[PDB]
Write a structure and sequence with these properties.
Layout: H1 2-12, E1 22-31, E2 34-41, E3 47-54, H2 61-73, E4 82-88, E5 91-97, H3 104-110, H4 115-134, E6 137-138, E7 147-149, E8 155-157, E9 164-165, H5 186-189, H6 196-211, H7 221-231, H8 244-253, H9 264-267, H10 283-292
Antiparallel strand pairs: 1-2, 2-3, 3-5, 4-5, 6-9, 7-8
Helix pairs in contact: 1-2, 3-6, 3-10, 4-6, 6-8
Modified residues (Phosphotyrosine): 37
Modified residues (Phosphothreonine): 175
Active site: 141 (proton acceptor)
Length: 294
């Protein structure tokens, strides 16, 4: 109910008008999720990203409440920091830390990462996933777009608009919520998947870092999902260019057998991650991709 939603949100948010607390507003995006602005915290001078939403044009308000509650109670160095929220009439504001280095999508579409840089990004993402999975949260929409980058090469995961909270009673899910190209095959072949769907999606993200795109990107999304379920583990265009340890890591992420697929905890121990360059190594790619995308 619309009234029940507003009151629940009222209990969650800080009181008052956020316009008193933030200045220097500039639109940096707009879409189905609302409008995003950069702004300046008037008190601390921190640059923030504010997501503005009119609740009259949100079809699934249950998901935004869940989104904020999960962010609030699952803070992590590798998760984009949720700062505050406000509600003024029908206008919901979600305040996030701003990462000035864009997304991983910008990096993979505009630059060519080396294995040391890829290992660093995979490590950081797996740190976020281990934490989420150990707290019974499945992200369910892991993809380069949801990996945001600091100018210092910080690597942070965001968008909890699609996440699932699981329990030992109900350890598995069936809803197909993720972006098709990054979806694990079991999401379509069965009606029971768990946390390792995020691991499969990370493997697809590693293919992005290698080849610039997920497999089947050019295909209709409806075809892609049929392609995933029938082709299984996707084939690299030039597997011979990769080190043996990186090939092993990819195979453990993209394993068809869910039991055999690596968990986040296990994969943090993988020797591919040990070739990681300092995160500072990403700064030139971040700067290059930033300049290339305006």
């Amino acid at each position: 109910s619309d009234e029940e939603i507003l009151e629940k949100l009222r209990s969650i948010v800080s009181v008052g008008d956020p316009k008193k607390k933030y200045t220097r507003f500039e639109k940096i995006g707009q879409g189905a999720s609302g409008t995003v602005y950069t702004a300046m915290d008037v008190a601390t001078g921190q640059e923030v990203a504010i997501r503005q939403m009119n609740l009259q044009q949100q079809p699934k308000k249950e998901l935004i409440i869940n989104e904020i509650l999960v962010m609030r109670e699952n803070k992590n160095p590798n998760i984009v920091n949720y700062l505050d929220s406000y509600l003024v009439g029908d206008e919901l504001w979600v305040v996030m830390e701003y990462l000035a280095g864009g997304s991983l999508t910008d990096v993979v579409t505009e630059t060519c990462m080396d294995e040391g840089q890829i290992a660093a990004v995979c490590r950081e993402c797996l740190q976020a996933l281990e934490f989420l999975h150990s707290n019974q949260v499945i992200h369910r929409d892991i993809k380069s777009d949801n990996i945001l980058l600091g100018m210092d090469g910080s690597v942070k995961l965001t968008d909890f608009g699609f996440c699932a909270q699981i329990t030992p009673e109900q350890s598995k899910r069936s809803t197909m919520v993720g972006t098709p190209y990054w979806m694990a095959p079991e999401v379509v072949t069965r009606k029971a998947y768990g946390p390792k769907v995020d691991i499969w999606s990370l493997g697809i993200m590693a293919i992005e870092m290698i080849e610039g795109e997920p497999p089947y990107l050019n295909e209709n999304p409806l075809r892609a999902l049929y392609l995933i379920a029938t082709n299984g583990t996707p084939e690299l265009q030039n597997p011979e260019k990769l080190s043996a340890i990186f090939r092993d890591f990819l195979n453990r992420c993209l394993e068809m057998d869910v039991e055999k697929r690596g968990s986040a905890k296990e994969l943090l121990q993988h020797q591919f991650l040990k070739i990681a360059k300092p995160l500072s190594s990403l700064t030139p790619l971040i700067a290059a991709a930033k300049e290339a995308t305006k």
